[PDB]
Design a protein around this ligand. Structure first.
Ligand SMILES: *[C@@H]1O[C@H](CO)[C@@H](O[C@@H]2O[C@H](CO)[C@@H](O[C@@H]3O[C@H](CO[C@H]4O[C@H](CO)[C@@H](O)[C@H](O)[C@@H]4O)[C@@H](O)[C@H](O[C@H]4O[C@H](CO)[C@@H](O)[C@H](O)[C@@H]4O)[C@@H]3O)[C@H](O)[C@H]2NC(C)=O)[C@H](O)[C@H]1NC(C)=O
Ligand SMILES: *[C@@H]1O[C@H](CO)[C@@H](O[C@@H]2O[C@H](CO)[C@@H](O[C@@H]3O[C@H](CO[C@H]4O[C@H](CO)[C@@H](O)[C@H](O)[C@@H]4O)[C@@H](O)[C@H](O[C@H]4O[C@H](CO)[C@@H](O)[C@H](O)[C@@H]4O)[C@@H]3O)[C@H](O)[C@H]2NC(C)=O)[C@H](O)[C@H]1NC(C)=O
Ligand SMILES: *[C@@H]1O[C@H](CO)[C@@H](O[C@@H]2O[C@H](CO)[C@@H](O[C@@H]3O[C@H](CO[C@H]4O[C@H](CO)[C@@H](O)[C@H](O)[C@@H]4O)[C@@H](O)[C@H](O[C@H]4O[C@H](CO)[C@@H](O)[C@H](O)[C@@H]4O)[C@@H]3O)[C@H](O)[C@H]2NC(C)=O)[C@H](O)[C@H]1NC(C)=O
Ligand SMILES: Cc1n[nH]c(-c2ccc(OCC[N@H+]3CC[C@@H](C(N)=O)CC3)cc2O)c1-c1ccc(Cl)cc1
Ligand SMILES: Cc1n[nH]c(-c2ccc(OCC[N@H+]3CC[C@@H](C(N)=O)CC3)cc2O)c1-c1ccc(Cl)cc1
Ligand SMILES: Cc1n[nH]c(-c2ccc(OCC[N@H+]3CC[C@@H](C(N)=O)CC3)cc2O)c1-c1ccc(Cl)cc1
Ligand SMILES: Cc1n[nH]c(-c2ccc(OCC[N@H+]3CC[C@@H](C(N)=O)CC3)cc2O)c1-c1ccc(Cl)cc1
Ligand SMILES: Cc1n[nH]c(-c2ccc(OCC[N@H+]3CC[C@@H](C(N)=O)CC3)cc2O)c1-c1ccc(Cl)cc1
Ligand SMILES: Cc1n[nH]c(-c2ccc(OCC[N@H+]3CC[C@@H](C(N)=O)CC3)cc2O)c1-c1ccc(Cl)cc1
Ligand SMILES: *[C@@H]1O[C@H](CO)[C@@H](O)[C@H](O)[C@H]1NC(C)=O
Ligand SMILES: *[C@@H]1O[C@H](CO)[C@@H](O)[C@H](O)[C@H]1NC(C)=O
Ligand SMILES: *[C@@H]1O[C@H](CO)[C@@H](O)[C@H](O)[C@H]1NC(C)=O
Ligand SMILES: *[C@@H]1O[C@H](CO)[C@@H](O)[C@H](O)[C@H]1NC(C)=O
Ligand SMILES: *[C@@H]1O[C@H](CO)[C@@H](O)[C@H](O)[C@H]1NC(C)=O
Ligand SMILES: *[C@@H]1O[C@H](CO)[C@@H](O)[C@H](O)[C@H]1NC(C)=O
Ligand SMILES: *[C@@H]1O[C@H](CO)[C@@H](O)[C@H](O)[C@H]1NC(C)=O
Ligand SMILES: *[C@@H]1O[C@H](CO)[C@@H](O)[C@H](O)[C@H]1NC(C)=O
Ligand SMILES: *[C@@H]1O[C@H](CO)[C@@H](O)[C@H](O)[C@H]1NC(C)=O
Ligand SMILES: *[C@@H]1O[C@H](CO)[C@@H](O)[C@H](O)[C@H]1NC(C)=O
Ligand SMILES: *[C@@H]1O[C@H](CO)[C@@H](O)[C@H](O)[C@H]1NC(C)=O
Ligand SMILES: *[C@@H]1O[C@H](CO)[C@@H](O)[C@H](O)[C@H]1NC(C)=O
Ligand SMILES: *[C@@H]1O[C@H](CO)[C@@H](O)[C@H](O)[C@H]1NC(C)=O
Ligand SMILES: *[C@@H]1O[C@H](CO)[C@@H](O)[C@H](O)[C@H]1NC(C)=O
Ligand SMILES: *[C@@H]1O[C@H](CO)[C@@H](O)[C@H](O)[C@H]1NC(C)=O
Lengths: 258, 130, 130, 258, 130, 258
């Protein structure tokens, strides 16, 4: 056990404290001075690509899920939305409970559909973080519901005080989800796919998708076309700081070189 | 204790979303039947890293997680909304849960003016002592 | 602010229902197995429009709706039971959330008897000054 | 946003205020001095007939329902209970959530069954009022659950202080519910109906029902009999302040004249 | 009132279970993914009948049942978690819900040191009266 | 109505009081000084055998169930777990609501399966006690969920202050459950049973079960074997303070004598 820390401003700096450790000059005149806020793991420098992010989550039985509310959040660049089944067709994730909606500000929504063994009743965050929904934070992942990874803080505010929204969905297929041998594919259309790499940024995927549509490199067949990208092409530090490609074909695999 | 950000990076700007706290509604927009849907109830804001508050806040949320997760493990409530109300109650009990001994360090009663009300009346009877 | 009923009509009598707050149960009636069903837990009462309170109350509930609906829009709780407890907390924080400066307008401490305890002892040393 | 107002008695009169706007002489010594109460729209003079009342409600999607409790209410003369389906048979209203029961004091329960387009996930009050159930107030209508229209107030009480229950169900059939072209029928039995008018009061409907049973003007056929009432008959101001009829017959329509 | 155990028997020893309130976690055990399951979150303890507290406690719980069951009958909450928080609020309102008249029986303000601060300064002007 | 009493220590003794009836010298410095606890009916001397315990419970309609939490409990010697159906196969008890788990410390879990008329929507405690689950107390019994009978108390603590876990399941079959003519059978295996008596203690049942297995007195037939125990055998005051048997056989009944 431990006491839940509380943020307070003293000597022009934020400090951790608690209601029992304040001096008489600190003043709390209404419950409106207290706030709960959610901060995104994005802002701490974590890798946000789909292969790296999914390795932070895992399945576990025997632990009941828990939910806590928060009042304000941060605009997210990367969010995630999962539709995972077992190879026998059964769902791996539970439907979203009544009143739990997706995170409300996501520049990119990485939507992953696929299969895995799912050896556990619920999927938790392996580092103890939370999955942030619409002003509710949960310890587990809900099916088909957009979330951002984050953590919660509690504040006392001082007495005094001193563009639109665009969202783009990026779809993926996955096999062996949640294991050591997971493979990912970025979806151009229902029959044209790109083998995914950890180094691919969102805008690289969107522009690679554009060149495929405008160069006419989609599948013209009943069958599935999968493009591979050689190491020596360039791909677009943290998020806050073309004609040149050539396509050759070898299901059906192929390679895109510079 | 003070807060030491020990993260690999810090985004020094906070672009946030929340619901509106102040200002009356415009016309019929407060009626659920006519008002916005769930996606349109939000306002936005932006604050910069003055006094290092943004990077401190990121570290604070990180350090809060262990105690918060242990609290959630021990509660049987499915959804917890009462943390801030309980903090407010504990604030009041710490200062007013016992007898307030004036001039003591744990009693937030100032009789400074109360002295100058009585120490100005030193010459209410000691000086008009004709 | 004062309350101005601006409704087309007012029913000046209030015939109400509620649950009982005072008085111990009779015999085994407090045991759920033996007690009344959901339809039989109510008491009734009647109050008239003394001091215009009934017509004022009808207007008050009407005027409360906008702020209450905006609060419900912004909460994620499915069912809200905590409004009155939060009002009580805010009552206490308004008067005791800071240092109480005696004699000030925001400090609810009366030292009236405290003066007559000390101003009666003016003649405890100034008069037995033999 | 706005602060939820609070009722307090000052100078022998009720006034609106809040906990932050009270003087030191106002005293709150226990949570038992605070009360939440529900007042019925009936008491403000609104028309309570079924045609007028249903026009205050409408269907809307995209807004999650919300519930708030109240501790005491007012005896109602008119309550309502709805069983509406779409013409394809699907239900228009959701089943009552666990623990939500009907309003407990209704002199007349207007029970409406019928069909309509129901263009929306939930039915709300077009004027922002609440639907009052058993000490719970909701922003939406639940299926087959008796409610009264009303609003909620919050009070601080001062330190000091200074017949049975009968209920009658009145049944209706409706078509085109929730639109501009709704038609209503008052139900005498499963085969005898009266075309409804806004001017019909509850006791007029009950006594009209009695004369039909005692004059033998019910249907004596497999088919449905619908009586119309000419304008020049009389019908029974607010609620708190026979041999003469002649029946002639023209499904099967007919007319009742004086 | 005092508590009179009127039960057929009393087990004078209390072998109890609960969750842990103090002490930080060991390593990663605080993370839900790595921590114990629902069956392994408990600690145990044992207390004996010193000052007759155990047999008094058994009688107290027995006598609490009627009032608790009548409260549950009257609430519409399906699960009630707020009883202790409301007790804390009522504790504060009883002592600080009105004006605190110093020296009165209902005002928990001690000015004992406050007198010796002023009654020591009797000889701050009455004795250096050269 | 009545005020919920509160336990406080004064003059080296526990007393009942309330927050409004404390003197200024009583100090409450944090919500951590307040506690809710659950005490077992076992500790008051009640009979705990299955026939006696089930007579304290009964079915009743029209009363909504209610739940209240508690923070700490007492190790139990006897707990109960019920799977009762009507003779037509329908379940008598509701499934456990989300988040309600069995009582966590039970030396003996008496698991009863059988049939009865179950004339009521919910099963309540006839003496007004509670059914204690995992830190939640309910007024009704949930299906297949281990509980102990008990009651709740609320305390203010003073400022200052001054082996493993084994569980054994004992299975029973029952007919006419919840009536005046209930009959019980202790289950040795799926075909060998012992007619139950109120005087049988848990350890007597466990050792009687052992002698049956080690003497080879189980059924060696498709059919069911039921042993009866004559009055003059001995059986093991409250819980906190072999070769000699002979088996003769007369479904199939029999007798065990000394
Ligand atoms: C608050 O902020 C702090 C600091 O930013 C976060 O600290 C992180 O904590 C996690 C543990 O929960 C750390 O993750 C672990 O890192 C170990 C070291 O990784 C390095 O190891 C190789 C080999 O030495 C290096 O070459 C390489 O650079 C790696 O970076 C891993 O070994 C761990 O993985 C192993 O253990 C886990 C079990 O924990 C197994 O599941 C794995 O399969 C594997 O066997 C683990 O990944 C992380 O490194 C810490 N970050 C930093 C910057 O120190 C907190 O997490 C954060 N709190 C919250 C709530 O977000
Ligand atoms: C608190 O108390 C106040 C006062 O009693 C209530 O005020 C009512 O507010 C509603 C709006 O929410 C008003 O309803 C509107 O009335 C308009 C005027 O109605 C008159 O119009 C014709 C033509 O002029 C007159 O001949 C006739 O006498 C009518 O009385 C209507 O035009 C409105 O309908 C139109 O707009 C709505 C959208 O709002 C559309 O859906 C309709 O289809 C239509 O196009 C509307 O009906 C009402 O008149 C007010 N009453 C009074 C007495 O002023 C509050 O509602 C109340 N608060 C709560 C929460 O109950
Ligand atoms: C707090 O602690 C007190 C004291 O320990 C408990 O008090 C018990 O209260 C229950 C009632 O709820 C009592 O149970 C009743 O006992 C009656 C008397 O039993 C005796 O009767 C025969 C004939 O005289 C005696 O020979 C024999 O020794 C019995 O002991 C019974 O007559 C009652 O049964 C009848 O009424 C009930 C309705 O209540 C019907 O359902 C039955 O079918 C039957 O017709 C009933 O059983 C109990 O005796 C009290 N105990 C003591 C020691 O006094 C509280 O219950 C406890 N509170 C909580 C919440 O646990
Ligand atoms: C930088 C900044 N400035 N201001 C805020 C802010 C925070 C919370 C907030 O909550 C308003 C909802 N309101 C609803 C009910 C109210 C009640 N008690 O009833 C109370 C709460 C509004 C704000 O403007 C932030 C901020 C900080 C961190 C993060 Cl992650 C996001 C934003
Ligand atoms: C959610 C929220 N709303 N408003 C604020 C806020 C921010 C900064 C702040 O600084 C001003 C203090 N200023 C007072 C006067 C001067 C004096 N000498 O006192 C000089 C100093 C005051 C505030 O209220 C916050 C907030 C956001 C992030 C974090 Cl981390 C904490 C709080
Ligand atoms: C005219 C009048 N006089 N008195 C009342 C009254 C109001 C509320 C009330 O609530 C009692 C339930 N009680 C349960 C738990 C208690 C706790 N805090 O634990 C607190 C609440 C009892 C009353 O007698 C009214 C009144 C006013 C308006 C309307 Cl619409 C209806 C009635
Ligand atoms: C729910 C409830 N329970 N009890 C009351 C109540 C009603 C009237 C009231 O008037 C008496 C004041 N009386 C005090 C002494 C005198 C003095 N000079 O102070 C003369 C003045 C006091 C009450 O407590 C209410 C209530 C009902 C409706 C409304 Cl709108 C508000 C409150
Ligand atoms: C004899 C004894 N000594 N100590 C206790 C005891 C009681 C409660 C307790 O609760 C700790 C959980 N904690 C969670 C959150 C906390 C918050 N407010 O956040 C508060 C509560 C811990 C204890 O050690 C007992 C005791 C008495 C009667 C019974 Cl039946 C069982 C045990
Ligand atoms: C849950 C819990 N945690 N801790 C305690 C506890 C128990 C006994 C206790 O006695 C010590 C008082 N002691 C103070 C100093 C001396 C002085 N002159 O004051 C001499 C007297 C203090 C406690 O805090 C309890 C508890 C358990 C059962 C019950 Cl029934 C009530 C409380
Ligand atoms: C998973 O990781 C590698 C695959 O890259 C495999 O060799 C290893 O055996 C697996 N881990 C375990 C614990 O089986
Ligand atoms: C791709 O498949 C999904 C379901 O697998 C389907 O809903 C969608 O219409 C398909 N897209 C196209 C362009 O056919
Ligand atoms: C890929 O490009 C096509 C062509 O404009 C576009 O319609 C589609 O939305 C793009 N995909 C994504 C995920 O942006
Ligand atoms: C048909 O698909 C191939 C790759 O599968 C692509 O190179 C070719 O351009 C497509 N056909 C046309 C007419 O674009
Ligand atoms: C406090 O000082 C004012 C003058 O500023 C005086 O009128 C008043 O009487 C003093 N207070 C008391 C309690 O005498
Ligand atoms: C207050 O007055 C009483 C006499 O009524 C006296 O006994 C007491 O000592 C006075 N208070 C103090 C602190 O001296
Ligand atoms: C509904 O009202 C009338 C029917 O009385 C109809 O003429 C009108 O067009 C309808 N309203 C709309 C918006 O279509
Ligand atoms: C009328 O119809 C309802 C269902 O439509 C039925 O339950 C009821 O028994 C019928 N009434 C009569 C008198 O048959
Ligand atoms: C109509 O009259 C008949 C005859 O007495 C009666 O049984 C029936 O209940 C009445 N209907 C209503 C709605 O009161
Ligand atoms: C049969 O029904 C008609 C109206 O449909 C009514 O006038 C007539 O009186 C009924 N028959 C009898 C015998 O009452
Ligand atoms: C209280 O006494 C101290 C000496 O112990 C003195 O310095 C101080 O000034 C006194 N308080 C006031 C308000 O004068
Ligand atoms: C149940 O008890 C006895 C059976 O032992 C039976 O004679 C009696 O009639 C039954 N009680 C009732 C109320 O029928
Ligand atoms: C006894 O029966 C139960 C179900 O009635 C079954 O699950 C169990 O396996 C059986 N035991 C044996 C030893 O066959
Ligand atoms: C009865 O004895 C057998 C033989 O050891 C054992 O396996 C079984 O678990 C016993 N039953 C109980 C309920 O302990
Ligand atoms: C077969 O069962 C009987 C009792 O039914 C028992 O006495 C006998 O010992 C059993 N057979 C063996 C070989 O143990």
């Amino acid at each position: 056990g431990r006491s839940i820390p509380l943020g307070v401003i003293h000597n022009s700096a934020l400090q951790v404290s608690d209601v029992d450790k304040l001096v008489c000059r600190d003043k709390l005149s209404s419950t409106n001075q207290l706030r709960s806020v959610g901060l995104n793991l994005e802002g701490n420098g974590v890798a946000t690509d789909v292969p790296s992010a999914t390795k932070r989550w895992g399945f576990r039985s025997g632990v009941p899920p828990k939910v806590v509310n928060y009042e304000a959040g941060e605009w997210a660049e990367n969010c995630y939305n999962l539709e995972i089944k077992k190879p026998d067709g059964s769902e791996c994730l539970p439907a979203a409970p009544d009143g739990i909606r997706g995170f409300p500000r996501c520049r990119y929504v990485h939507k992953v559909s696929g299969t895995g063994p799912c050896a556990g009743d619920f999927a938790f965050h392996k580092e103890g973080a939370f999955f942030l929904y619409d002003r509710l934070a949960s310890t587990v992942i809900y099916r088909g519901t957009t979330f951002a990874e984050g953590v919660v803080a509690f504040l006392i505010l001082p007495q005094a005080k001193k563009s639109g929204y665009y969202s783009t969905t990026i779809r993926y297929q996955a096999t062996g989800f949640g294991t050591n041998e997971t493979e990912y594919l970025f979806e151009v259309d229902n029959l044209t796919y790109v083998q995914l790499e950890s180094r691919f940024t969102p805008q690289f995927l969107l522009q690679l998708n554009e060149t495929i549509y405008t160069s006419g490199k989609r599948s013209n067949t009943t069958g599935k076309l999968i493009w591979k990208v050689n190491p020596e092409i360039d791909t677009t530090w943290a998020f806050w700081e073309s004609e040149e490609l050539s396509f050759t074909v070898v299901x059906x695999x192929x390679x895109x070189x510079x | 204790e003070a807060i030491v950000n020990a993260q690999p990076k810090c985004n020094p700007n906070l672009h946030y979303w929340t619901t509106q706290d102040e200002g009356a509604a415009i016309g019929l927009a407060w009626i659920p039947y006519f008002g916005p849907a769930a996606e349109g109830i939000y306002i936005e804001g932006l604050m910069h890293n003055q006094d290092g508050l943004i990077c401190g806040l990121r570290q604070l949320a990180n350090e809060t997680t262990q105690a918060l997760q242990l609290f959630l493990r021990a509660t049987t409530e499915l959804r917890t909304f009462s943390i801030l109300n309980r903090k407010a109650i504990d604030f009041l009990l710490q200062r007013w849960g016992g007898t307030c001994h004036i001039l003591g360090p744990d009693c937030c009663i100032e009789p400074a003016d109360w002295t100058k009300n009585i120490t100005d009346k030193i010459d209410q009877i000691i000086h008009d002592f004709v």
